[PDB]
Paper text:
Human strains secrete two papain-like cysteine proteases (staphopains A and B), whereas avian strains express staphopain C (ScpA2). Later findings suggested that ScpA2, as a poultry-specific virulence factor, is directly involved in the pathogenesis of chicken diseases. The X-ray structure of ScpA2 shows the typical fold of the proteases belonging to the papain family.
In the present study, we determined the three-dimensional crystal structure of ScpA2 at 1.58 Å resolution. Data quality assessment using Xtriage showed that the crystals were tetartohedrally twinned, suggesting a (pseudo)merohedral twinning with four twinned crystal domains. Applying the relevant twinning laws, we found that the crystals belonged to the space group P31 with unit cell parameters of a = b = 103.15 Å and c = 51.21 Å (α = β = 90°, γ = 120°). Three molecules of ScpA2 were found in the asymmetric unit characterized by a solvent content of 54%. The final model of ScpA2 consists of a total of 519 amino acid residues (173 for each monomer), 413 water molecules and 5 chlorine ions. The three molecules in the asymmetric unit are highly similar (root mean square deviation (RMSD) of 0.09 Å). Cys23 forms a thiolate–imidazolium ion pair with His119 (3.5 Å). In ScpA2, the oxyanion hole is composed of two hydrogen bond donors: the Gln17 side chain, and the backbone NH of catalytic Cys23. In staphopain C, the S2 subsite constitutes a hydrophobic pocket lined with Pro66, Met69, Lue95 and Ala117, all of which are conserved among the three best-characterized homologs (ScpA, SspB and ScpA2). This S2 pocket enables the processing of substrates with a hydrophobic side chain at the P2 site, consistent with the information available on the substrate preference of ScpA2.
Author numbering: 1 to 173
The structure:
């Protein structure tokens, strides 16, 4: 379907997110595993590192702030940077070529509640489909595969039917 594909060369899906709030741990572990070419990172261990004192339900379900995500990157030797938007196709291409990882900070469009839940996902790279469409490839931690995201759209339709707006990004993992 694509005749240009640029992906982080060692990205692999090793674990998936079930009944927990560790999406940002999933995301950062997969990115850091890809860029360092390792398997030392995993969601639970990242969350334990950032939340050493939580146990029980609080440890199971408390996620990470952007600040915590940024501090984890820096702790692991990476010059991570906040981007208060979604990158362009071009920006993903360049980052990907440079073996730098991108974390997606999104929020749910749907809301029963008036609360719009936060979610973190990983960029895997970018491609040009036959016919010219520019797409960014995304790993939602829930999933055993990748989504193809129109690079002009900042709404990500996810595998349970929900929609997440790609609000911001942390690049440089």
């Amino acid at each position: 379907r694509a005749q240009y594909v640029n992906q982080l060369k060692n990205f692999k899906i090793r674990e998936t997110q079930g009944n927990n709030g560790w999406c940002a741990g999933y995301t950062m572990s997969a990115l850091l595993n890809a860029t360092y070419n390792t398997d030392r990172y995993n969601a639970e261990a990242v969350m334990r590192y950032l939340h050493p004192n939580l146990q029980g339900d609080d440890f199971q379900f408390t996620g990470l702030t952007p600040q915590e995500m940024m501090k984890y990157g820096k702790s692991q030797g990476r010059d991570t940077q906040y981007l208060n938007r979604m990158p362009s196709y071009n920006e993903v291409d360049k980052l990907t070529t440079n073996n730098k990882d991108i974390a997606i900070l999104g929020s749910r469009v749907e809301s029963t509640d008036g609360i719009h839940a936060g979610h973190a996902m990983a960029v895997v790279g970018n491609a040009e489909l036959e016919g010219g469409q520019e797409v960014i490839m995304i790993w939602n931690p829930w999933d055993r595969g990748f989504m193809t995201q129109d690079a002009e759209s900042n709404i990500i339709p996810v595998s349970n039917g929900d929609h997440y707006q790609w609000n911001s990004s942390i690049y440089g993992y």
